[PDB]
Design an enzyme around this catalytic site. Structure first.
Site, PDB file in Angstrom:
ATOM      1  N   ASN A  80      -5.146  22.884 -20.434  1.00 36.01           N
ATOM      2  CA  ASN A  80      -5.329  21.571 -21.052  1.00 36.01           C
ATOM      3  C   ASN A  80      -5.849  21.823 -22.543  1.00 36.01           C
ATOM      4  OD1 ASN A  80      -6.051  18.846 -21.531  1.00 36.01           O
ATOM      5  ND2 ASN A  80      -7.554  18.865 -20.098  1.00 36.01           N
ATOM      6  N   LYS A 119      -6.258  19.527 -24.727  1.00 39.77           N
ATOM      7  CA  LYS A 119      -7.003  18.272 -24.955  1.00 39.77           C
ATOM      8  C   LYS A 119      -6.498  17.752 -26.270  1.00 39.77           C
ATOM      9  CE  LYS A 119     -10.973  19.863 -22.117  1.00 39.77           C
ATOM     10  NZ  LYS A 119     -12.402  19.762 -22.037  1.00 39.77           N
ATOM     11  N   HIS A 146      -9.003  13.238 -15.332  1.00 39.22           N
ATOM     12  CA  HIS A 146      -9.907  14.105 -16.140  1.00 39.22           C
ATOM     13  C   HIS A 146     -11.199  13.416 -16.147  1.00 39.22           C
ATOM     14  CE1 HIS A 146     -11.284  16.884 -19.032  1.00 39.22           C
ATOM     15  NE2 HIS A 146     -10.453  17.818 -18.444  1.00 39.22           N
ATOM     16  N   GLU A 171     -12.962  13.285 -18.770  1.00 36.68           N
ATOM     17  CA  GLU A 171     -12.951  12.773 -20.177  1.00 36.68           C
ATOM     18  C   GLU A 171     -12.416  11.281 -20.137  1.00 36.68           C
ATOM     19  OE1 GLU A 171     -11.187  15.891 -22.604  1.00 36.68           O
ATOM     20  OE2 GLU A 171     -13.135  17.015 -22.214  1.00 36.68           O
ATOM     21  N   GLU A 198     -13.863  19.734 -11.463  1.00 34.51           N
ATOM     22  CA  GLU A 198     -14.370  20.070 -12.686  1.00 34.51           C
ATOM     23  C   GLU A 198     -15.994  19.818 -12.498  1.00 34.51           C
ATOM     24  OE1 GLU A 198     -12.994  17.806 -16.308  1.00 34.51           O
ATOM     25  OE2 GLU A 198     -12.101  16.590 -14.827  1.00 34.51           O
ATOM     26  N   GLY A 215     -20.551  20.917 -21.082  1.00 36.49           N
ATOM     27  CA  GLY A 215     -21.120  20.211 -22.058  1.00 36.49           C
ATOM     28  C   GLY A 215     -22.639  19.790 -21.917  1.00 36.49           C
ATOM     29  N   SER A 271     -15.819  26.223 -17.192  1.00 40.56           N
ATOM     30  CA  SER A 271     -15.668  27.257 -18.215  1.00 40.56           C
ATOM     31  C   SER A 271     -15.012  28.254 -17.676  1.00 40.56           C
ATOM     32  CB  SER A 271     -17.117  27.364 -19.005  1.00 40.56           C
ATOM     33  OG  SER A 271     -17.630  26.167 -19.494  1.00 40.56           O
TER      34      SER A 271
END
Length: 248
Positions: free
Chosen positions: A9, A11, A93, A95, A165, A171, A211
């Site tokens: 991805n 992004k 996703h 986000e 995820e 983050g 990650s």
């Protein structure tokens, strides 16, 4: 056995020049032919990438909408993706769920519409730090999955890959161990067995979307319920090749 699956991805990252370099690196690399590889450029670079990239890596969009066409300024339909020869889409996703407020149901509507239009889907799920601290990892994953299961048939799961995820370790300053990832993947697979079917549970790739880099990919890939990766930042780098080759 489930085919190992590595998605990248990108992004909101890339320029013509950087993407040309990224693609050239992939085009000159020796990849394990047992890995299914997908890359997800920003929408405006989909043409550049599909034209230049080796055909044995497929391309994904990072999002799409729930209708074929119409008065939806700024949105792209699955029909358009198919038209341009983009076989995959990433949906739900973290986000998009968190920053753009995409609900469980909106994501499930997208998954069904994309599948019905002949796309393959990487459907993303996972829990936040607060949810994990409350012991709600599977409550959350089960909710997100249930919404999808209510929209799609048992057969429809054939062209779905689930990306877990660990939003709690994305983050936030927290890191996940391979053992922690495996625990969630096994539980997701159990959810599929008990809610969809044993065949869907055994067939469905569940890929890790935390990650992932060249340094940790081998240890993650050794876990028996991890079928690959949805790679973030490392997908822009040459070490993506090493991740593709994580089982070698």
């Amino acid at each position: 056995a489930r085919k190992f699956f590595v998605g990248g991805n990108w992004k909101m990252n890339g320029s013509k020049a950087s993407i040309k370099s990224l693609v050239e690196t992939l085009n000159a690399s020796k990849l394990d032919n047992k890995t299914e590889v997908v890359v997800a450029p920003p929408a405006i670079y989909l043409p550049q990438v599909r034209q230049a990239l080796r055909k044995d890596i497929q391309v994904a969009a990072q999002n799409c909408y729930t209708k074929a066409s119409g008065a939806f300024t700024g949105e792209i339909s699955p029909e358009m993706l198919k038209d341009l020869g983009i076989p995959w889409v990433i949906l739900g996703h973290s986000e998009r769920r968190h920053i753009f407020g995409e609900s469980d149901e909106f994501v499930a509507e997208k998954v069904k519409y994309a599948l019905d239009q002949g796309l393959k889907v990487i459907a993303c799920i996972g829990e936040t730090l607060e949810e994990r601290e409350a012991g709600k990892t599977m409550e959350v994953c089960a909710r997100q999955l249930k919404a999808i299961a209510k929209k799609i048939s048992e057969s429809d799961w054939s062209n779905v890959v689930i990306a877990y995820e660990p939003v709690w370790a994305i983050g936030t300053g927290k890191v996940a161990t391979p053992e922690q990832a495996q625990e969630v993947h096994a539980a997701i697979r159990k959810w599929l067995a008990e809610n969809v079917s044993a065949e869907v549970a055994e067939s469905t790739r569940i890929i890790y979307g935390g990650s992932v880099n060249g340094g940790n990919c081998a240890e993650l890939a050794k876990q028996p319920d991890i079928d690959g990766f949805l790679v973030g930042g490392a997908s822009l780098k040459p070490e993506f090749v090493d991740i593709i080759n994580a089982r070698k």
